[PDB]
């Protein structure tokens, strides 16, 4: 009976649910040929987390664990635990430990260790999520460092994500390509389903963040279906969904006028009636307001 609501947050008060970044712009790309099936930032409107989605902003694309050993390419083998430090049980009905990255790329960040007064070290590191050595569902991943020696085995280890190492052709950055969580040629399990617009004239609406680069040319971005604050809010409220589609309006908070309308789908994603690709030209101080429960056949005003 608990009523459905969205948090009241402008675009500049939102963060990405797929990488630790603020939301920069709303975005559409109707001509996208990839299947959209990201695993972070997935939450139903009645508050069921899906895929690898968890609540901590610090947990997104983060890893916790211990280095086991040093391994033409310097590389280190790391057991990964759950974010709360408990051992990951591979028989759990999730694709991978919650927070695991959900895209192919060279993720750039910092590995830090505190020995179990203890010695400490931190170095820049890269995790290639497309690598056959990337097996978070098996509790093990590898990272590489520019540093050659100063990583200790058997010591508590943290990966703090910062951005991408590269987006050149051989860096395999593709935000819609899932990692193979159990390693090469294994089938991913327990995935959140893919999403698509159903009603003619509609396209997906994304919350877009630009992601930092260690080097090279590029302006890469990460698009999420809902911001992390919405995941958190929906989870808290656990409001029953009264139809498959909620109508929402992006409104100016000062004036209350509707800038545009969207459909918020029960599985946790937005569609709009827009024939253009690219960033949405709208005020950043706007926010989404729940209007009413509708269905898939509701005709949105064009934006």
């Amino acid at each position, epitope marked *: 009976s608990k009523p459905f609501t969205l948090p009241i947050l402008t675009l500049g008060e939102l963060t990405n649910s797929r990488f630790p970044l603020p939301i920069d712009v709303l975005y559409t790309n109707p001509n996208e040929s990839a*299947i959209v099936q990201c695993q972070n930032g997935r939450c139903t409107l009645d508050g069921e987390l899906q895929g690898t989605t968890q609540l901590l902003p610090t947990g997104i694309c983060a890893f916790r664990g211990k280095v086991t050993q040093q391994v033409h390419r310097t590389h280190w083998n790391m057991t990964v635990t759950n974010l709360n430090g408990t051992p990951f049980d591979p028989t759990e009905d999730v694709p991978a430990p919650l927070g695991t990255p959900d895209f192919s790329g060279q993720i750039y960040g910092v590995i830090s260790q505190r020995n179990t007064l203890p010695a400490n070290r931190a170095h820049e590191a890269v995790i290639a999520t497309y690598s056959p050595k990337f097996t978070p569902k098996l509790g093990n991943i590898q990272f590489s460092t520019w540093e050659t020696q100063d990583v200790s085995s058997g010591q508590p280890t943290k990966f703090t994500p910062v951005g991408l190492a590269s987006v050149d052709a051989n860096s395999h950055f593709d935000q819609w390509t899932l990692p193979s969580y159990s390693g090469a040629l294994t089938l991913n399990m327990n995935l959140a389903p893919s999403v*698509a617009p*159903v009603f*003619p004239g509609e*396209c997906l609406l994304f919350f877009r963040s630009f992601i930092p680069l260690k080097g090279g040319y590029g302006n890469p971005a990460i698009d999420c279906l809902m911001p992390q604050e919405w995941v958190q809010h929906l989870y808290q409220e656990s409001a029953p969904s009264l139809s498959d589609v909620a109508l929402v309006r992006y409104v100016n908070p000062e004036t209350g006028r509707t800038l545009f309308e969207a459909k918020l789908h029960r599985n946790g994603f937005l569609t709009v009636a827009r024939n253009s690709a690219g960033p949405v030209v709208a005020p950043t101080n706007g926010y989404f307001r729940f209007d009413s429960w509708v269905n*898939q056949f509701y005709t949105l005003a064009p934006m």
Partner: nanobody
Amino acid sequence: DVQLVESGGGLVQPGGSLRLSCAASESILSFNHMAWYRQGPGEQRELVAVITREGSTDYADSVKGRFTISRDNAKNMVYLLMSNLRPEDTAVYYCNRGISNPWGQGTQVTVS
């Protein structure tokens, strides 16, 4: 990126019935939705019926109470059972997981 094929259209008298079948090249359980669409001559494609992964359904007002959409997850098939067919139901019918996925050939339904 998914391939689709639909069939079961043909020529029927008013009040008649048809069953449309749709086959997909990937698991329909991985998609949020499956849907049937139709397009009359010189018109844009319109949504007719939609079914969620859980089996929840919704219909256009024009076919409500006459059409049923259903899915077989084990045979990876979606169906549209059409009863009390009317001349205005004449169109080419398509199945898809959504509007952003490439379309199959379609199946012609003619009610005369």
